[PDB]
């Protein structure tokens, strides 16, 4: 079995403004993103999206999809279910909230089917209880009989999905078990079934949470199926190239200051909407005794806290996922909410120095523009 393309959208929502906050979607999404990439999926991973952002991300995902393409959606965050319809709850939902504030998974399925995907996979790592404030009784249109649909729900209808309250890293229950199986060369339905068995052995979740699989898939399609890669339309290749650009951060640039010092500006991706910037004092003409380099003046859209920027360790920025994957001895800054970027990312590298003999500090600073960062390119 071969797939014309494999494409995944992964969303983790943790920091709700009007509802309890979550911790593990960041690990779940990060680790799943990596496993999917090992299977050659073109993946977009996004943290903490609003309703508007979630819809836009879905619109981008849909653009990738084409006849024969395997599409996968993974969601870790708050959700609800009314009348067998699954809804994803964005971080900007009010309390209480209604369906119009959320995204209905089935509608996404309908749109995917309109693209003639070869496989539709939904992994919904969220609660499935009712939202009683939402009183609407939607007449969702009947889906076409694709025979390509697989739902892996972290929990059963009417029940809850969980993560572990452990300080430091810990997956949610679903990912805890999924990640050990995900790379298996098996029909995705069978794989999920093994996953359901693994979860059943969890004492902590017994009687509270169990995987539910819903499938109408009539062919031996596996996540490990090879990409055919022969029939791309030119428009697709450009879309693929654009996706690759979103996937790739700007390469590091060496900044030359008028006073002759050089600073290394380095970039790392945590998610498609989360970048880490690091700076280091690579070079000094001797005449200058002391050097200080630091970053600032970010776009407001990013809502970056200067208290939380220019840190000794990546860990200090709220970047726990990437470390020791980053050059040591560098200031670190975490740019999250990259999707909120109206204008090319522009910021300021500032430098403070004293010359040997001279005793007064000098202040020089230059605007760097990497322009669009990651996901932002997509539009």
């Amino acid at each position: 079995m071969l797939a014309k393309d494999k494409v995944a959208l992964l969303i983790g929502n943790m920091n709700y403004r009007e509802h309890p906050k979550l911790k593990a979607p960041l690990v779940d999404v990060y680790e799943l993103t990596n496993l999917l990439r090992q299977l050659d999926f073109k993946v977009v991973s996004l943290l903490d999206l609003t309703e508007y952002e979630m819809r836009n991300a879905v619109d981008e995902f849909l653009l990738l999809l084409d006849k024969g393409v395997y599409g996968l959606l993974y969601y870790a965050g708050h959700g609800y279910e009314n009348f067998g319809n699954s809804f994803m709850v964005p971080v900007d939902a009010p309390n209480p909230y209604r369906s119009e504030n959320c995204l209905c998974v089935q509608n996404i399925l309908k749109l995917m089917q309109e693209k003639e995907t070869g496989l539709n996979v939904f992994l919904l790592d969220m609660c499935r209880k009712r939202n009683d404030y939402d009183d609407t009784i939607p007449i969702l249109d009947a889906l076409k009989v694709t025979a390509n649909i697989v739902f892996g729900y972290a929990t059963c209808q009417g029940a809850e999905a969980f993560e572990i309250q452990h300080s430091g890293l810990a997956n949610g229950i679903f990912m805890k078990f999924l990640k050990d199986r995900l790379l298996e060369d098996k029909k995705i339905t069978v794989l999920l079934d093994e996953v359901a068995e693994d979860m059943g052995k969890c004492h902590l979740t017994k009687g509270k949470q169990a995987l539910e699989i819903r499938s109408s898939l009539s062919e031996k399609r596996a996540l490990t199926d090879p990409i055919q890669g022969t029939e791309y339309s030119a428009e697709s290749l450009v879309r693929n190239l654009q996706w690759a650009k979103a996937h790739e951060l700007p390469e590091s640039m060496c900044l030359k200051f008028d006073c002759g010092v050089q600073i290394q500006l380095g970039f790392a991706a945590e998610f498609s909407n989360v970048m880490i910037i690091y700076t280091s004092i690579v070079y000094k003409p001797p005449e200058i005794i002391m050097c200080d380099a630091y970053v600032t003046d970010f776009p407001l859209d990013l809502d970056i806290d200067p208290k939380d920027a220019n840190k000794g360790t990546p860990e200090e920025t709220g970047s726990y996922l990437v470390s020791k994957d980053l050059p040591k001895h560098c200031l670190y800054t975490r740019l999250s909410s990259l999707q909120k970027l109206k204008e090319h990312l522009v910021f300021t590298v500032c430098l403070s120095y004293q010359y040997s003999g001279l005793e007064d500090t000098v202040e020089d600073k230059q605007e760097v523009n990497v322009g669009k960062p990651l996901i932002a390119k997509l539009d």
Partner: peptide, 4 residues
């Protein structure tokens, strides 16, 4: 245990 955390609820989602």
């Amino acid at each position: 245990l955390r609820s989602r």
